[PDB]
Amino acid sequence: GTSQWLRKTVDSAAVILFSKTTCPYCKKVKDVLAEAKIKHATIELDQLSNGSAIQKCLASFSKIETVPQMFVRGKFIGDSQTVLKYYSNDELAGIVNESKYDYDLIVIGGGSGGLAAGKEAAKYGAKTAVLDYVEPTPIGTTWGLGGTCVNVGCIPKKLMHQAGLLSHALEDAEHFGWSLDRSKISHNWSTMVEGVQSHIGSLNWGYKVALRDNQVTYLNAKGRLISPHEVQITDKNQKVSTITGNKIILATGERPKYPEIPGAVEYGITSDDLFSLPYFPGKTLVIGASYVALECAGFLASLGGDVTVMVRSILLRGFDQQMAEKVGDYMENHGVKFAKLCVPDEIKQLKVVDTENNKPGLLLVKGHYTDGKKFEEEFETVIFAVGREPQLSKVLCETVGVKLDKNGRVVCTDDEQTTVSNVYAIGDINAGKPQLTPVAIQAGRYLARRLFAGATELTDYSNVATTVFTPLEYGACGLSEEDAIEKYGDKDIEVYHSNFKPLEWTVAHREDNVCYMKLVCRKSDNMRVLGLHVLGPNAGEITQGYAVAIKMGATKADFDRTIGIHPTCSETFTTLHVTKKSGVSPIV
Amino acid sequence: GTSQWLRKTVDSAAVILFSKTTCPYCKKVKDVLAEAKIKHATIELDQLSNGSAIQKCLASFSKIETVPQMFVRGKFIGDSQTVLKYYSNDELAGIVNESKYDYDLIVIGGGSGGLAAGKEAAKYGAKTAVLDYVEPTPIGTTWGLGGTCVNVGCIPKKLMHQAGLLSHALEDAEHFGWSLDRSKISHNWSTMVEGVQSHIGSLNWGYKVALRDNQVTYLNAKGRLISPHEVQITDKNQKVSTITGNKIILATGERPKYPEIPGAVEYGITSDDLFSLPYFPGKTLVIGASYVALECAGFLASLGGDVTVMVRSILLRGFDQQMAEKVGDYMENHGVKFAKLCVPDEIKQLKVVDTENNKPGLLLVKGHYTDGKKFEEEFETVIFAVGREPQLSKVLCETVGVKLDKNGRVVCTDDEQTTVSNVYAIGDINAGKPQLTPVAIQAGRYLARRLFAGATELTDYSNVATTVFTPLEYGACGLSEEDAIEKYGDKDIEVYHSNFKPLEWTVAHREDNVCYMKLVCRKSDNMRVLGLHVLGPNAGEITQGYAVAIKMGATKADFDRTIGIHPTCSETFTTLHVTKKSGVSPIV
Numbered sequence A, B: 001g002t003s004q005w006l007r008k009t010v011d012s013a014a015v016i017l018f019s020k021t022t023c024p025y026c027k028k029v030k031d032v033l034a035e036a037k038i039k040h041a042t043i044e045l046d047q048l049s050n051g052s053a054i055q056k057c058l059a060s061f062s063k064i065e066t067v068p069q070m071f072v073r074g075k076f077i078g079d080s081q082t083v084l085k086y087y088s089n090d091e092l093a094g095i096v097n098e099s100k101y102d103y104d105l106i107v108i109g110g111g112s113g114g115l116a117a118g119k120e121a122a123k124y125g126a127k128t129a130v131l132d133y134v135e136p137t138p139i140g141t142t143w144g145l146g147g148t149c150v151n152v153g154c155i156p157k158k159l160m161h162q163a164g165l166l167s168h169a170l171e172d173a174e175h176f177g178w179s180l181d182r183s184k185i186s187h188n189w190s191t192m193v194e195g196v197q198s199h200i201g202s203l204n205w206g207y208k209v210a211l212r213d214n215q216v217t218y219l220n221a222k223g224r225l226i227s228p229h230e231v232q233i234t235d236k237n238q239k240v241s242t243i244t245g246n247k248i249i250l251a252t253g254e255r256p257k258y259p260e261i262p263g264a265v266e267y268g269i270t271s272d273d274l275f276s277l278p279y280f281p282g283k284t285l286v287i288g289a290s291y292v293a294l295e296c297a298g299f300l301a302s303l304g305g306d307v308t309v310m311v312r313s314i315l316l317r318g319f320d321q322q323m324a325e326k327v328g329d330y331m332e333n334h335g336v337k338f339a340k341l342c343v344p345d346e347i348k349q350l351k352v353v354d355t356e357n358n359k360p361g362l363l364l365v366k367g368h369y370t371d372g373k374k375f376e377e378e379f380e381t382v383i384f385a386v387g388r389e390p391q392l393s394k395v396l397c398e399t400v401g402v403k404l405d406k407n408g409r410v411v412c413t414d415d416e417q418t419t420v421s422n423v424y425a426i427g428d429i430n431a432g433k434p435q436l437t438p439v440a441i442q443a444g445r446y447l448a449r450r451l452f453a454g455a456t457e458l459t460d461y462s463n464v465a466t467t468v469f470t471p472l473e474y475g476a477c478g479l480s481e482e483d484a485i486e487k488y489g490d491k492d493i494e495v496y497h498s499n500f501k502p503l504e505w506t507v508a509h510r511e512d513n514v515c516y517m518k519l520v521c522r523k524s525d526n527m528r529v530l531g532l533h534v535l536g537p538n539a540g541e542i543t544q545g546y547a548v549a550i551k552m553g554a555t556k557a558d559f560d561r562t563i564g565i566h567p568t569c570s571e572t573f574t575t576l577h578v579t580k581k582s583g584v585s586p587i588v
């Protein structure tokens, strides 16, 4: 029990000191340690419930039962007298850097998860290497350190969303007394892209500074695991070599998919290219219906584009379908065209991209609807958003023994461990987990504490709030209504809901009954909240706080007894009362 | 136990039916009452823990143990056969309408709590009248049905706050690529006031419609309690008369104070006058330091006014003072000027309000600083925001026996009951309760259900969240840092904090280390979150959700194990780790 934890902690910790907060010999050892600039983990036995038990168990490794006790890579080094003797004899530096391998930890992939893992592990004295390479898109688009979110994902996408939100703020301003004429104002795409890219550039740079200041080695090279402890690297000059590491963390992300049709790779683009495009897309076709598809089609329309979305089946497969359909109807009412139940067959090039004068080409898209009828229409830009996939064939040799599922994602236990005991996986490539940046970040930091600092806390993957950043945002936490009914039966589900209008929309003469929120509850479990859903402005800021309450098991009564903040949209959750079974209208 | 509840429910309800959902004789009676348009409360014994016990206790009043039993105003009326007999004989309507008093409920005050209480009561059959009258301001300002929040509080101030926010949105849009020029744009006060007042007018009218469609008598007359059940009314022709009611609810609110100095009443204004002012205030002096003073000064400066605030002692007395200071420091950097430790001595008139050309007058304000030095400066408008108070001598005769406190506020027990047993007080005049609009509404609806529907739920006044809508907003829930330390001692308090930067501020080139948040926690109670504080955009939306977790007693561990939504401001609460005790900087 206590003993098995100690054995695991001592085995993989790189440098760790067992200590008591009261002991002056402990403080004497702490003082020598970072004077010599030795980073390490520390466990204060007088602050745990079973410290006396651990103190006893330490003797199984050291033959002594006192504090301080210092360990390096699973080997007892000394008590106070012994460490000080190593210091003043100039022997301490070589003791702490002795290792079977070059690195205590190799991180393959320099994105949200891997950057978080590397930095956290280095703080406890693990010798750490982070590898990141960015394979170019079909047209050659490339970018710097930081991963999918920082460069071609959450960060540029939300800033482009904001430029689109500012469109309606210029309209709203007139009604609130400002003298501008919105009709005489236009948007400059390339000026936006320069500002977005200047921020992304400063994130590239920050992360490089951050690794240097934590003493992490950063190799801008492609990594390939060839055995449990061996990683093969290829640099920018195609020079190949091998480095060894004790623990390996796989965190190499995904990349966009292309449909297997003529013209797609040659003439279409993905989100990987959208966020640094040197020209405005112009008349655009977005193929797909994921959140990526709708977010991108969303702000393109708010900026002035002529935009069409071609939907194979439904919007936001996997989310609550009433909420998804409300999202879609709002977009269709503010300019976005939809070609429903439709798939593409081929893209033909009518004009090559005008790289000189900064203009799009021109394409012919040919498809069919599910009932046979034909689709044929010209566009300037075709954006494919039909899913993402990893390619561990380029990262991982099959003979290494790491097991993958059907989709090609790594099969792990709930501690991120793969089928090779010293190899772990985090982030989008960990099968079954939500594919989100805060999850990758949290999973990576908690793994590093378990490996190198004796921690035990696991990452909790359930009930993770999300927000889709469409022109009217949609935030949610927990089960969709149809999933709640599938799991418990309609008789045991009760849904409270209401429309609402933000106070800001009143003077601006915006829509009365478009925003909507609902609570999906379980009758036989004290009306437990199973899912929260809200469509409206600032939905991510609204939802986040309630995720803490849901993680705690909140009921409808918890929502009833809490008082609202006035005036806000979020307060509507505190006085909800109309049920779906009652058939009363939710309009206001 | 059960017995004293049933006695209380039966004595107080106006029309109540004890039923079971499974009984066809009950459905038969429900139908007859519906058809005759008789409103009533219902208690379904087959859905109560001790419904079998209650069934037996009903016999104390009716001599029967069966279902249904209908009561009117404490008196048993009959079972199924007896009710249908009264119906078939055209006797029912005079039986339900007979009463010792004119009304079951008289509400004095047609505002937040007042209207909420009256509408809820009428739903369960109680015959209800609501009285409202708006005593003019010194310069003659008057408004319609709805109370302070609707007409001269939360609703008009937050709309004017929103017009201020739009000035920075116009600035930001250039950076996101919009071709406007903020430098060549101005603001029209009268245009904004017209939009605000029109939305208010639609609320005035909606409230009256709501009372009519709930069968509530609305009397636009001044009411006065002269004895426990007698209310004297004086209409708009100064006709005087008397009405009587069983239950009485006082809900008359407060109005602004003036300081006892020459010229203040004659030449200054207050928030009562500012939201319908026909002319822009121009160069404005705001006297006081409340959230009223700071919100109004904040939006006046954002709409281009030259604004000064005079502060007797501190900003936002009673709020966390670290946060108060961050609030004012932001306002001071963005335009607002402050005369600190200063009080006014007299207001002298130099120009009269030019009522033709729609222009302010001109004042000379004289006063002194706390050390002795002298303040003298001219202003076009002077706004007093130095507190609010009730004046129950206008409303309630001292001979009735309703105990007041030293501040003129009504002393009640934890169920809103005064010292006269049939009279209650809700909202801003209830002594010691937080003076907010959603509190008053909850107090009113919950009280009406205890009086007329047999409910037991009390209002929970603890840990109610707030938001101050200064140009950078401040939201809070629970104790200030100073209050928490004083109550448990510095050794037992841990504080986690951090700065942040909204992602919307990056491309707009706004400040880096101005937004801020902290969690104030008790070490010896499992790191329980005692108070939450955030300064930043959309602070109300951010804060609302966390109040449900705090009502449930969240700990730091609950925040840690919950995942964030990215990219949002609110997610910074899910990864806090820097402590104040440690000395590590909170900048990013």
Ligand SMILES: Cc1cc2nc3c(=O)[nH]c(=O)nc-3n(C[C@H](O)[C@H](O)[C@H](O)COP(=O)(O)OP(=O)(O)OC[C@H]3O[C@@H](n4cnc5c(N)ncnc54)[C@H](O)[C@@H]3O)c2cc1C
Residues within 6 Å of the ligand: A108, A109, A110, A111, A112, A113, A114, A131, A132, A133, A134, A135, A146, A147, A148, A149, A152, A153, A154, A155, A157, A221, A222, A223, A224, A251, A252, A253, A254, A271, A292, A394, A395, A426, A427, A428, A429, A435, A436, A437, A438, A440, B566, B567
């Ligand atoms: C358009 C878009 C918008 C999104 N918006 C959001 C949002 O608002 N919120 C949210 O939570 N999530 C969002 N996501 C999801 C988010 O991007 C991912 O969940 C997140 O990036 C997960 O990061 P990761 O650590 O799993 O891998 P990544 O961030 O993809 O990093 C992996 C890195 O490893 C590199 N790599 C691959 N192979 C090798 C190799 N052999 N050697 C070296 N390096 C290699 C890759 O090039 C990449 O840089 C969005 C995604 C997309 C595509």
Ligand SMILES: Cc1cc2nc3c(=O)[nH]c(=O)nc-3n(C[C@H](O)[C@H](O)[C@H](O)COP(=O)(O)OP(=O)(O)OC[C@H]3O[C@@H](n4cnc5c(N)ncnc54)[C@H](O)[C@@H]3O)c2cc1C
Residues within 6 Å of the ligand: A566, A567, B108, B109, B110, B111, B112, B113, B114, B131, B132, B133, B134, B135, B146, B147, B148, B149, B150, B152, B153, B154, B155, B157, B221, B222, B223, B224, B251, B252, B253, B254, B271, B292, B394, B395, B426, B427, B428, B429, B435, B436, B437, B438, B440
């Ligand atoms: C400038 C300002 C801004 C505010 N902003 C907010 C905010 O953002 N959020 C928030 O939660 N709270 C806010 N408040 C506070 C909130 O408006 C009050 O707490 C709330 O309106 C009080 O409710 P009430 O029902 O107790 O009284 P009121 O709303 O004042 O209603 C009482 C009514 O009774 C009438 N009356 C008085 N005497 C008589 C009589 N004898 N006969 C008949 N009628 C009578 C009054 O004229 C008035 O119409 C603000 C207050 C002010 C002044």
Ligand SMILES: CCOc1ccc([C@@H](C)N)cc1
Residues within 6 Å of the ligand: A403, A411, A412, A413, A417, A418, A419, A420, A421
């Ligand atoms: C705990 C060692 O890691 C493992 C990883 C995956 C699996 C199974 C689920 N494929 C088993 C063990």
Ligand SMILES: CCOc1ccc([C@@H](C)N)cc1
Residues within 6 Å of the ligand: B403, B411, B412, B413, B417, B418, B419, B421
């Ligand atoms: C139930 C109403 O009883 C009351 C008893 C006491 C007080 C204060 C004055 N002590 C108020 C109401």
